[PDB]
């Protein structure tokens, strides 16, 4: 209906918002971007589903996201491909694996705070619904 695609609409503008804030942090940069074959070749092999908040920027658009539910997902994939490509005690990893953790808490107290709980529950039974 016109009343469902309103709300998906909602969830897509709710959606950018808080990734435009996501990826105008500082700490968040390296997880911006696609990482570049040239300077990193191993990881298009050892990543197998790469994620990132421009990639997830153009899901929203392709109105690939229903629900925060499956938004979440890809958060929390750019964030456990960043713990498993950076596992080593040495600084680099730690300091990666650091801001990936801080991507994801941020990204869960933003929408704890600001998603309504109803709003969220209705895009889940629209979704349930097709
Ligand atoms: C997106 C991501 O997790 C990523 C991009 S580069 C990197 N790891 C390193 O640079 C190590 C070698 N210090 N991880
Ligand atoms: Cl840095």
């Known amino acids: 209906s016109m009343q469902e695609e309103d709300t998906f609409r909602e969830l897509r503008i709710f959606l950018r918002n ?6 105008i942090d500082k700490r968040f940069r390296v997880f911006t971007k ?3 074959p040239d300077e990193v070749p191993d990881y298009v092999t ?11 920027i ?10 925060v539910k499956d938004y979440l997902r890809d958060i929390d994939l750019i964030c456990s491909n960043a713990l498993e490509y950076n ?8 300091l ?3 801001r990936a953790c801080a991507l994801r808490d941020t990204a869960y107290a933003i ?3 600001e998603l309504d709980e109803d709003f969220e529950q209705l895009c889940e039974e629209i979704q349930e619904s097709r």
């Open 46 to 56: 050892v990543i197998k589903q790469p994620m990132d908040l421009s990639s997830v």
């Open 18 to 23: 808080v990734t435009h804030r996501l990826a």
């Open 58 to 67: 153009s899901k929203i658009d392709l109105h690939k996201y229903l629900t």
């Open 34 to 36: 696609p990482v570049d």
């Open 111 to 113: 929408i704890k705070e």
């Open 96 to 98: 990666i694996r650091h």
């Open 87 to 94: 596992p080593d005690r040495d600084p680099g990893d730690r």
